[PDB]
Amino acid sequence: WALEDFEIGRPLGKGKFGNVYLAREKQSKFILALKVLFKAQLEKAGVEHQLRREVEIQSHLRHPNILRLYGYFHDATRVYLILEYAPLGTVYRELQKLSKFDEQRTATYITELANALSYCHSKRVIHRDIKPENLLLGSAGELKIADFGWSVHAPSSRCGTLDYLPPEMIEGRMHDEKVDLWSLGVLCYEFLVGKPPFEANTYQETYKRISRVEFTFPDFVTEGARDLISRLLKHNPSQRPMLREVLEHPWITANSSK
Ligand SMILES: CN1CCN(C(=O)c2cc(Nc3ncc4cc(C(N)=O)n(C5CCCC5)c4n3)cn2C)CC1
Ligand SMILES: [Mg+2]
Questions:
Q1: Which residues surround ligand 2, an ion (CB under 5 A)?
Q2: Domains of the chain and any CATH numbers
Q3: Antiparallel, parallel or unpaired: β 143-145 and 78-83
Q4: Where does the Protein kinase domain start and stop, copy by copy?
């Protein structure tokens, strides 16, 4: 693959390490998203193994709720990821659009997330990073996890606006699959309320709020949601439900679709 090969369209998203662009493949007329990262800035920040964790993992996972990486190439200056395109954009933009979600949309995304994370954890891979700006919508409004790296494998290991990160990760202790489960809780909450439960005004404050696990529920939050989120947001990782217990949880089934 090479640049010429594609016509590039409008830009889809901001320069993390470069932008991502809508794009069309000349031969087949295939519409895709082209993540464009300048080598310069990767090396300067030394995250090439993160890139080289996004690539391997996203190409070898195949699941309807995981964004697909089709291939890559580089030139002199830049590395190019060829991604699946998610026509309806991010859950982040949708949340900004509606401010909060209803229970049906929420339970439905939590379910699509739980299956995608279920597949993920079966191959021992853990995402570590399911913010809403990494959740994308397909053409049917199907939720799709993207990004990857930072990432996966076994127990582990290694500025991430803190919000979705669990206590063990924040202190630097040892973590497993359960990190994602806590994130599901932060997400669940965020969807219903419109703001993540440890949202604070400063990194340092947020860090307190997470380590202490201090959040409260606005009054409009139904008994069963609290039940799911309360259960998901425990300090001790091993007292966090497994995904099949989430997928069960009476509230999810009272509200999800399928
Ligand atoms: C109708 N509308 C929904 C879609 N709209 C969008 O502009 C849009 C589409 C997409 N699609 C898309 N597809 C694959 C992606 C892979 C990525 C990625 N970088 O992993 N992104 C990002 C670009 C910025 C946020 C997410 C992707 N975005 C992002 N945006 C911001 C506009 C409003
Ligand atoms: Mg992101």
A1: 133-134, 147
A2: 1-89 (3.30.200.20), 90-256 (1.10.510.10)
A3: unpaired
A4: 6-252
| Amino acid identity for residue 227 in this structure | D
Burial 201-240 (b: 16+ CB within 10 A, else e): eeeeebbebbeeeebeeeeeeeebbeebbebbbbeebeeb
Q: What approach was used to elucidate this structure?
A: X-ray
* 180 token code pair: 């994602």
The DSSP bridge partners found for residue 25 are 6, 30
Q: Is 248 helix (H, G, I), strand (E, B) or coil?
A: helix
Token couple for 130: 């399911």
Which of 20, 55, 93 for a ligand 1 pocket mutation test, highest count of atoms within 8 Å of Cβ? 20
Q: Is 54's C-beta closer than 6 angstroms to any atom of ligand 1?
A: no
Tell me, what amino acid is at 181? L
Q: How far apart are CA 164 and CA 39, in angstroms?
A: 28
